[PDB]
Amino acid sequence: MPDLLTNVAENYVNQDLFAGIEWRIDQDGKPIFQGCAGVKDIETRTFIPKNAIYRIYSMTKPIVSFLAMMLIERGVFRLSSPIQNFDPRFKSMKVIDQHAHIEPATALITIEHLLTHQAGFSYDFSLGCPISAHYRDAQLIEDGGRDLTDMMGVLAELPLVFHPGTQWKYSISTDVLAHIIECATGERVDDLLQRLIFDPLDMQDTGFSLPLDGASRLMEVYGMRSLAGLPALKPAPHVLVPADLGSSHPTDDPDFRRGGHGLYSTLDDYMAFANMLLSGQTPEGETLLSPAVLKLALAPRVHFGARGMRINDEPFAGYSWNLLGRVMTDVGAAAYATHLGEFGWSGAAATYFWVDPTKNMTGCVMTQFLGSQHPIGSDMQAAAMSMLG
Amino acid sequence: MPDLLTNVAENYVNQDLFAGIEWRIDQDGKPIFQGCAGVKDIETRTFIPKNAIYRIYSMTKPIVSFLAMMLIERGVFRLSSPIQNFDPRFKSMKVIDQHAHIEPATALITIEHLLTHQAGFSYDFSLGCPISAHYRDAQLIEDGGRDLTDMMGVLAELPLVFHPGTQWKYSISTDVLAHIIECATGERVDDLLQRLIFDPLDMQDTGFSLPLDGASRLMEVYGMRSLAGLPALKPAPHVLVPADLGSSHPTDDPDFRRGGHGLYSTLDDYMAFANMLLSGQTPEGETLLSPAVLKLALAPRVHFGARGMRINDEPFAGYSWNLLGRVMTDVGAAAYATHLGEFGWSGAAATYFWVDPTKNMTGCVMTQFLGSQHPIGSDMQAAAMSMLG
Amino acid sequence: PDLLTNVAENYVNQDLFAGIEWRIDQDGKPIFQGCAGVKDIETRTFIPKNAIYRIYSMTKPIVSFLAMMLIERGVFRLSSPIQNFDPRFKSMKVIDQHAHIEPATALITIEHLLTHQAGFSYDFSLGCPISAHYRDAQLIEDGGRDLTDMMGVLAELPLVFHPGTQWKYSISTDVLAHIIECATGERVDDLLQRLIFDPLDMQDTGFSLPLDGASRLMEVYGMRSLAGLPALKPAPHVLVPADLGSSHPTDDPDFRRGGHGLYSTLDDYMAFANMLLSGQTPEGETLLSPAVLKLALAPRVHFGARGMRINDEPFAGYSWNLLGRVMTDVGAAAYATHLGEFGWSGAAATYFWVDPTKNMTGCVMTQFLGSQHPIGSDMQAAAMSML
Numbered sequence A, B: 001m002p003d004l005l006t007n008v009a010e011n012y013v014n015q016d017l018f019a020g021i022e023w024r025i026d027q028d029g030k031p032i033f034q035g036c037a038g039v040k041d042i043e044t045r046t047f048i049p050k051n052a053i054y055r056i057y058s059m060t061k062p063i064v065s066f067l068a069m070m071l072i073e074r075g076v077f078r079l080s081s082p083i084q085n086f087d088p089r090f091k092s093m094k095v096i097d098q099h100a101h102i103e104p105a106t107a108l109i110t111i112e113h114l115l116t117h118q119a120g121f122s123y124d125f126s127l128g129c130p131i132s133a134h135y136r137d138a139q140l141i142e143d144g145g146r147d148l149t150d151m152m153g154v155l156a157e158l159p160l161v162f163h164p165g166t167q168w169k170y171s172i173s174t175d176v177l178a179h180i181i182e183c184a185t186g187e188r189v190d191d192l193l194q195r196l197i198f199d200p201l202d203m204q205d206t207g208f209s210l211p212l213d214g215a216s217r218l219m220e221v222y223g224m225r226s227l228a229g230l231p232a233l234k235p236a237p238h239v240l241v242p243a244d245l246g247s248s249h250p251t252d253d254p255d256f257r258r259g260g261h262g263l264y265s266t267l268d269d270y271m272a273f274a275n276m277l278l279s280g281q282t283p284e285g286e287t288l289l290s291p292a293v294l295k296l297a298l299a300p301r302v303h304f305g306a307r308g309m310r311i312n313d314e315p316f317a318g319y320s321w322n323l324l325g326r327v328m329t330d331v332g333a334a335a336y337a338t339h340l341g342e343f344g345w346s347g348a349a350a351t352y353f354w355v356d357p358t359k360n361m362t363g364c365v366m367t368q369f370l371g372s373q374h375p376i377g378s379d380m381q382a383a384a385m386s387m388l389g
Numbered sequence C: 001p002d003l004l005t006n007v008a009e010n011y012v013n014q015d016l017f018a019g020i021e022w023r024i025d026q027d028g029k030p031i032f033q034g035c036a037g038v039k040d041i042e043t044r045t046f047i048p049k050n051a052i053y054r055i056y057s058m059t060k061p062i063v064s065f066l067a068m069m070l071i072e073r074g075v076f077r078l079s080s081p082i083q084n085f086d087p088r089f090k091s092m093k094v095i096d097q098h099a100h101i102e103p104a105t106a107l108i109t110i111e112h113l114l115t116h117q118a119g120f121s122y123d124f125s126l127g128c129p130i131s132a133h134y135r136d137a138q139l140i141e142d143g144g145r146d147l148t149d150m151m152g153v154l155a156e157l158p159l160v161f162h163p164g165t166q167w168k169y170s171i172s173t174d175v176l177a178h179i180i181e182c183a184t185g186e187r188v189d190d191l192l193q194r195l196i197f198d199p200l201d202m203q204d205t206g207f208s209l210p211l212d213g214a215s216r217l218m219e220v221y222g223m224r225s226l227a228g229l230p231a232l233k234p235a236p237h238v239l240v241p242a243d244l245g246s247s248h249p250t251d252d253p254d255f256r257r258g259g260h261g262l263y264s265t266l267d268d269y270m271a272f273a274n275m276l277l278s279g280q281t282p283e284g285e286t287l288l289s290p291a292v293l294k295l296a297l298a299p300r301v302h303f304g305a306r307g308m309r310i311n312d313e314p315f316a317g318y319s320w321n322l323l324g325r326v327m328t329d330v331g332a333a334a335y336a337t338h339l340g341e342f343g344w345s346g347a348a349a350t351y352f353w354v355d356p357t358k359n360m361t362g363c364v365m366t367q368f369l370g371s372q373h374p375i376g377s378d379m380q381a382a383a384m385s386m387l
C-alpha cells in the first residue's frame, strides 16, 4: 500500500539510470496516481517542464493501428484487403531464407498481415535476420528525411523473410500500413491522425513535428543503442550519455510521417488515447470506434508457441498479439504483475503504457532512454498493479 | 453512429457493382434498420418493386437443414442414420483420389455427414476437385428440369472424394439430404417445407416456383460466373451484365425442387425464418424446433485447422460449421465485425444473412449478382455490427 | 568432335570469357588440351606461356591435403579441438536467425574445419545470420591483414550452428591454415612450399607472383563485388575488369590464407590433381599414404533432399569429403561424371576434377567472378563425352 511507483522512479533517477521520468495511472477516466522524478536533461539539470514532450517511438503503432480500424469501420478497406490493390509496387513479392534461397511469395500481403506483423517484413535493426542488412543498406529507418512514399518504393523491392501469414516477426509493417492508408484514402496519414484521433481527443501536443512552443519542452534522449551500424551482439552499457539520432527523427520537418515511430507526445496526451481504448469513445461520448470493431481489434489474434512472443529474442511472457499490440492471455505465464486482458505497447526510448479493463485502469510511463538494460515500463506497471487491489 | 448500411449499399449501386440492394436488420424481432438502393434491372431502371423476389441459392441450405432437424425431433430418422437405409442406391459407395486411385468407402454416409458436408460429395463447380468434372459431365446442377429423384440416381453412381466422416468439403450433400427426406417420409420436400416451415412463418412468397404475381417482382440477376463450363482459373470481371441461367433455375416448373439451391424468397420472408432461429418458435409461440434440438443444431460441430474453413479456397475466417451453416467461434480470427456465436449462411447471387444471439439481432441483404468480386454480405454485416453497440 | 574446343570457343565468341585454358590427363599424360581467347580483351594479348590464374577456392584442396599430411605425421588428428592450439576459439557462441545467442555445445575440431561443419560462415553468404558482421569486420576484404590477426577478429564472432550439426561452406579452411601454423610453429606458405609444391615441381604456385610473373597474370573480369552486400540477383555477366581492392595482393610477402589467395598455372594444378590419383609424385615419392588418402577421399558429409548447396546453388549428386566434392550418385548428377569423381573450383570460375575410374584428371583455367555460366562443369562434361 505504499507508493511503489514513486519508489521505482526515484530509485532509477537516484541510480543515474534515467534522467527524468513522468507517470500517470487513471481509473474510471480520472487520475489516481501520478508523479515525476529527475530532470529534463542531466547536463543543465533543468526541471521537467510542464507538458514535457517525449519521442514515443513504437507507441506510434497502436495509434496508427487504431486509425486503420476506424477506416475499416468506415469501409475504406478490410482486414482481408490485399495491399497490392492500393500500391501495385507490392505485387510480386519474393521471400528469402537464411540459406540464400529466394522464391515468389505464395500469398498476398493483406491489411490484417500488416496489423499482426505476419506480412513477412523485417526491421533494420533485427539481429541475425536474413534481410535486415539490406534494410540497413537502404537506410529505411535511418533516413528520416525521405518521404514515406519514397521509402516504401525502396522497401517494396526487397524480399520478405517468410510467406505472408505463416509466421510472426515484429517489423516495419506498420509503416507499410501508414503508406497503404495514404494510398487507399488519397490523404496523408498525419492529417488523418489529426482529424480523426488527435483533435477529437484534444491531444494538442501529439504529431510528427514539435509544436510551436515545443523546443523548450522536449526531453533529452539518452543511451548508447545506435541506429547507424550493425545490431550489437551484446547490449551496450546502460549509461546516461545523450543519444545521437542522426537524421532519423526530425523535429521540424512538415512532411515527416511514419507508421511505426516518429510521433512526439506528452504524458497527458497519451493518457487521453489510452483511456479512450477502454470504450472507443471520447470523454464527451463521441464514438471513435464502435464496440464491435474495438472488440475485433482487441481480441487475441496471434498465439505463440513454447518460446512465446519474442522481439530480438527478448520475451513478452504470457502475451499474445491483437491488432493494436500486446494482450495478456495467461497470467500464469506472465513475468510481472498484470491481469487477463491487459493490453498496450511501448517504444524504443523506454516509454510504456497499458490498459487493464478488469480494473478500468490505464497507465503510462514517459522517459527517454534508448537501449535500456532496465525494464522500467514493466516495473512501473507492476508497482501500479500492486497498488490497486 | 451514422447509417453505414445505407452508405455501403448506395456506394455499391453508385459504382455500378450491383443493380439493386435491399436490407433489413431486426432486433428483438422488430426492424431497427432497413433500406433499399438501386433498381430492379439496369436495362429499364424499373424501381425495386414491393416484396421483390430473389433467387437465394445456398440460403436454401439452412432451411432444408432446419427441416431435417424437425424430422429428427419427430423421429423420422437420426443424425446417425445411414442414408442407404432410405435409398439403397447409396449402398456400396466408392472413393476416388487425385492420383486416380479408387477404393470402396470404409464408412457409411449418415444424415449427420450430409448436414456437415463430411459425406465425401463434391460440387460441379469445385475447381481442381478430383470428381467435379464427372459431375459437370452429368450436368447435376445445370439440368434443373431433371427430377430430384432422377438426378440423385445419377449422382449415386459417382465416387466420393474422401471416406465419409474424414474431411470437410462444401458439397451437393444438401440436395442428397432433400432426397433422403423424401425417401424417409414418402412426401415431397417442397410440400414438407410448405407445411412445416413456410406456412407457420407466413413466408407466402418462398418456394421453388414464382408466385402467381411473381414475374413482375423478380429481380434481375447479373454477373459473368457461368454454370455452363469449367470452373475458372481466375475470377471473371465484375460487370453488371445479365446472367444466363440456362435451364438450371426454372421459374414455373411445378416439380423443381432441390436441397442446396433453387428457392425464391423475399427479404421479408427470409427475415421471418432468421428471426425464428433465435428461439425455434413462430412469433405467436408455436414451436417449430425444441430448444434442445435447436441447441444441438447450432453447436459448433466441424472445427478447422490452420487454413480454416474454405470453399474454392475462399476463407471463412474464425468460422466453424454447425448443422445449419457457419458459426463464429473465434472473434480474434474473424476478418470482419461479428460476435461469438453469430451464425447463418449465404448464396451464389450474393444474398447473405446472419443471426447474432448476443444482440438478439438478425440481418439479411438481398441482391442478385453471380460471381461477385465484392463481399457485400460481410460489408453489410460489419456496418450493422458497428451500428448496434 | 573436339567438344572441349567447341565449348571454349563458343564462350569466347559470345564475349562471356576473355581467355580459357584446359588440359585433361589420363594415366599422368595429356590426352586433351587447348586454349581459346586472350589474356586481356583490352590489348588482346595472347594467353602467355605458363599463364597465371587466381585460383580462389581451389586453394582449399591444397591446404586440406597439407592438413592430411600433418595428421599422418602426428601433428594433430581429426578429433583435435582447435582451441588446444589457439585458445581464442575457446568459449564460442552460436547465433540464429531469430537473434538468439547461446554458448556452443560442442568444441570445434580439425574434422569440423575440413568438412565445413564448424559453424563458421562467409562474408558473402546471402541471408546468413552472421555474414553482415563478417563484412563489417572485412575478413575477406582486408587482404593486407595478417592471417593471425584476422583470426583474432573472427574468433570473437558467433557461429551460426553448433559445431558438427550442419554443413555450411565457410571461412573454416582459413581457420585450418591458421591452426596449422599454431600447431607447427611454421607459416602455412612455407609448409605448402616444402611439403607439396617443391616435391611436385609446382614452381609457379604461391600467394605472391614470381619475379617474372606480372606479364603472365591473366586479367580477371566480372561484376560480382567483394565490397558491398551480397546481391539479391546475379549481376549481368559482362567482361569488365574486376576491382579486387586490397583483397588479393600480388607482391605481399606475408599474404597467406587457407580458403583462397593462391596463384597457380594450368600445369602446376594438373601436377597436384594427378598426384591425388595415388598420393605420390611422378617419381614415386609418397606425399600421403594410401590409407590416409582413402580416409581423405571417402564420402563424409551426406546431404538431404535439397542436396549440397552454396548460396542455394546445387551440387547435384555430390557429397563432401575432407578435400572437396565427391560424386556419390550418378543418377542424381546434373552433368557427365562417374562414381567417385572428386575435386573443387574457385570464385573466378577455375575448375578441376579427378576421376579414379578413368585414371583421369582435368582442369579448366579462366578468370571471371560471378559467372552466370557453369564453364567448369561444361568442360568436364565435354571431356567425359570424348572418352
Ligand SMILES: C[C@H](C(=O)O)c1cccc(C(=O)c2ccccc2)c1
Binding pocket: A056, A057, A058, A059, A125, A141, A225, A226, A227, A248, A260, A261, A346, A347, A348, A349, A370
Ligand atoms: C523498434 C524500435 C522501437 O520503437 O522499439 C524502433 C522503431 C523505429 C525506429 C527506431 C529507432 O529510431 C532506433 C533508435 C536507436 C537505435 C535503434 C533504433 C526504433
Ligand SMILES: C[C@H](C(=O)O)c1cccc(C(=O)c2ccccc2)c1
Binding pocket: B056, B057, B058, B059, B125, B141, B225, B226, B227, B248, B260, B261, B346, B347, B348, B349, B370
Ligand atoms: C454453391 C453455389 C452457391 O449458392 O453459393 C451454388 C449452388 C447451387 C447452384 C449454383 C448455380 O446455379 C451457379 C450459377 C452460376 C455459376 C455457378 C453456379 C451455385
Ligand SMILES: C[C@H](C(=O)O)c1cccc(C(=O)c2ccccc2)c1
Binding pocket: C056, C057, C058, C124, C140, C224, C225, C226, C247, C259, C260, C345, C346, C347, C348, C369
Ligand atoms: C567463396 C569464393 C570462392 O572461391 O568460390 C571466395 C572465397 C574467398 C574470397 C573470394 C573473393 O575474394 C570474392 C571476390 C569477388 C566477389 C566475392 C568474393 C571469394
